[PDB]
Amino acid sequence: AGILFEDIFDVKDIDPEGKKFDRVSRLHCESESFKMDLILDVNIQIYPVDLGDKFRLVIASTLYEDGTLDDGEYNPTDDRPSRADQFEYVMYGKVYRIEGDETSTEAATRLSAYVSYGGLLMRLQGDANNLHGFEVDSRVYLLMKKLA
Amino acid sequence: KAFEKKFRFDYTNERALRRTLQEDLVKDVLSNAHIQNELEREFERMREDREVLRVIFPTGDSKVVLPCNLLRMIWNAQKIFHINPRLPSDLHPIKVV
Amino acid sequence: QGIEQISKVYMHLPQTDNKKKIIITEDGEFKALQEWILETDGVSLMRV
Amino acid sequence: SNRPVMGIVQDTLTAVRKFTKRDVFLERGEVMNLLMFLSTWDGKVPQPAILKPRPLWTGKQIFSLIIPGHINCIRTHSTHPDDEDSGPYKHISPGDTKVVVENGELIMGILCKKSLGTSAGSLVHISYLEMGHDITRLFYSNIQ
């Protein structure tokens, strides 16, 4: 499978700070199941998103749904079955930071994982249990699909 | 107070030592007092160097020009060796000193 | 009264750290006291 | 002044600022055309930052290819607000105004005079101090 995280998120804000970039919008979202906060930069020009929209989000280490590493190289000719076919918005990025509420002694109950999808930033914050699959400097795919 | 809290090695806190170092290193640090004496000497000479820096820069300007960028070199080492900042390390304090 | 060769004397409080008086407090922090420093349009260093 | 004497200049500097803006997306043909001008390219086309609905690469990705070796650098764009570093979005800049080059890859921030200029601590200065004069030359040429 190689799915580090999966949930359904509901859009709460589209640009609380303001529309800083024309083709990129910062969605502030919440997940009902795991109660995870999400901040995500999305290319609204090709994938428009509106307030109150619900979407399934999947953060996976690979797209081949067989455990095979993607190698991080573009390969459009590949015909291997891919989990990206089921989803509408696919991004490839690198997790570059993992913050936590851990003190000098106690572990982290809450974790915040930061991913950079070629400049489009994502911040998945919530319970440390749900974010145990995130390791810094690890390539990761983000998969989004609107739900009616 | 901040200098002591940030630079004085704390070999008394077993929980913190477990969080930072591996179990064998924690045992070595806690068990024998020779390593503790070495760490205390390290902090003492650092305090002396702190007074020397106070004399050298009465204005308190911490910006200085030096040959090697230790912070960037540490960052380079972390990236090169894939140092995970979450797991406990296997770097032993007397080795550091 | 006064010293020769000194025409005018200006008294003012410095708003820059360099001219401020930096001391080390009991806690060990650097505190930049605002003190009265006066300059002159003439030079008599020994007498001043 | 222990800082680079030559840096990126008028057209290249303005265009790299625009290029490194967050919302720059390059199609496949544009990406290949730009890659044709990389003397140091390894020949491997990077995975696009966006794969669907269409494959799109970012100016940050292309500049990450431009950046030599695995240098690490932290800078701030000229329009960086001072309160962001104290705000809750310190490590996720709303304005993409914090430059973080990690492992030779530009992961966030807008490059400008502060990052590619003659100022000490610049990306080019770190490139010179890490990779050497030849690799920094290739860097200046590839950016331009």
Asked if the structure places residue D2 within a domain, the reply is no
SS3 assignment, position A30: strand
Asked if the structure places residue D89 within a domain, the reply is yes
Q: How many domains does chain A have?
A: 1
Beta-carbon contacts of residue D85 (< 8 Å; ≥ 6 apart): none
Q: Is A104 near chain B, with CB under 8 Å? A: yes
* Nearest chain B Cα distance for residue A71, angstroms: 18
Show the CA angle centred on residue A37, arms to residues A93 and A121, nearest 5°: 25
Shortest CA distance from D126: residue in chain B: B72
For residue A4, give the amino acid letter: L
Contacts 24+ apart (CB under 8 A), A3-6: A3/A58, A3/A59, A3/A60, A3/A61, A4/A59, A4/A60, A4/A61, A4/A133, A4/A134, A4/A140, A5/A57, A5/A58, A5/A59, A5/A124, A5/A130, A5/A131, A5/A133, A5/A134, A6/A56, A6/A57, A6/A58, A6/A59
Q: How many domains does chain D have?
A: 1
Instruction: State this model's resolution in angstroms.
Output: 3.3
CATH code of the domain containing A10:
2.40.50.140
Alpha carbon D10 to chain centroid, angstroms = 16
Contact between residue A139 and residue A2 where contact means Cβ atoms under 8 Å apart: no
* Nearest chain D Cα distance for residue A88, angstroms: 6
The C-alpha torsion from A46 through A50 and A56 to A58, rounded to 10°, is 50
Domain region containing A9: 5-148
State the Rg of chain D over Cα: 15
According to the entry, how was the structure determined? cryo-EM
CATH code of the domain containing D136:
1.10.274.100
Residues of D in Cβ contact (< 8 Å) with B69: 129
Minimum-distance CB partner of A121 among D23, D25, D92: D92
- CA dist A51 and A85 (Å) reads 25
Domain region containing D89: 10-144
Asked if the structure places residue D131 within a domain, the reply is yes
Asked if the structure places residue D3 within a domain, the reply is no
SS3 assignment, position C20: coil
Residues of B in Cβ contact (< 8 Å) with C25: none
